[PDB]
């Protein structure tokens, strides 16, 4: 299923905080949250980085 | 599908290199690769870090 935010792009934007990540959003939408200094939408941890994730 | 290495755990071990990640192994198997100084199994980039990834 697509990014829960835009419903258009795949869930390829891994929201990384320490050793864990929440993957529920696209890279574009996750980056927007990081750039706006917003926390992770599912766990409220501050975002360290967005990783463009490929499901090999 | 499960981790392509152990066939037991989920694909929750994101192999991070720069801004991208390859997600095909579990955290346990991916950590073994990083600890043994192995590159990413699909792209041969050095592994910067393993992120335990939850698919939401
Ligand atoms: Zn999106
Ligand atoms: Zn989170
Ligand atoms: Zn495994
Ligand atoms: Zn790779």
Residue numbers in the entry:
A (entry chain AAA), B (entry chain DDD): 427 to 482
Please share excerpts from the published article on this structure.
The importance of the ubiquitin ligase murine double mutant 2 (MDM2) as a key negative regulator of the tumour suppressor protein p53 has been studied extensively. Second, it promotes the proteasomal degradation of p53 by recruiting Ub conjugating enzyme (E2) thioesterified with ubiquitin (E2~Ub; ~ indicates thioester bond) via its RING domain and mediates ubiquitin (Ub) transfer from E2 to p53,8 where Ub is preferentially conjugated to lysine residues located in the C-terminal lysine rich region of p53.9 Although the relative importance of these mechanisms is context dependent, in vivo mouse studies with ligase defective MDM2 resulted in the same lethality as MDM2 knockout experiments. The RING domain of MDM2 has been discussed as an alternative target to stabilize p53.19 The rationale for this approach lies in MDM2′s ability to still bind and inhibit p53 when MDM2-mediated ubiquitination is abolished, thereby preventing uncontrolled activation of p53.8 The RING domain gains its E3 ligase activity through dimerization with either itself or the RING domain of its catalytic inactive homologue MDMX to form a homodimer or heterodimer, respectively. The dimeric RING domain arrangement is essential for E2~Ub binding and activation as demonstrated by co-crystal structures with UbcH5B–Ub (en dash indicates covalent complex).
To elucidate their E2~Ub binding mechanism, we assembled MDM2f in complex with UbcH5B–Ub for crystallization and obtained crystals that diffracted to 1.82 Å. The asymmetric unit contains two copies of dimeric MDM2f with each dimer bound to two molecules of UbcH5B–Ub. All UbcH5B–Ub molecules bind MDM2f in a similar manner as observed in the MDM2h-UbcH5B–Ub structure, where key interactions are fully conserved. This includes the hydrophobic interactions between MDM2f’s V430 and I431 and UbcH5B’s F62 and P95 and stabilization of the C-terminal tail of Ub by hydrogen bonds initiated by MDM2f’s R470 (Figure 2g and (h)). Like in the crystal structures of free MDM2f, there was only little electron density for residues preceding the RING domain. These structural data suggest that the N-terminal region preceding the RING domain of MDM2f is inherently flexible and the presence of E2~Ub does not restore the 310-helical conformation observed in MDM2h. The lack of 310-helices could explain the reduced UbcH5B–Ub binding affinity. Nonetheless, MDM2f binds UbcH5B–Ub in the closed conformation suggesting that it utilizes the same RING E3 mechanism to activate E2~Ub for catalysis. The 310-helices in MDM2h contribute to the stabilization of UbcH5B–Ub in the closed conformation and their absence in MDM2f and MDM2z might be responsible for the reduced binding affinity for UbcH5B–Ub.
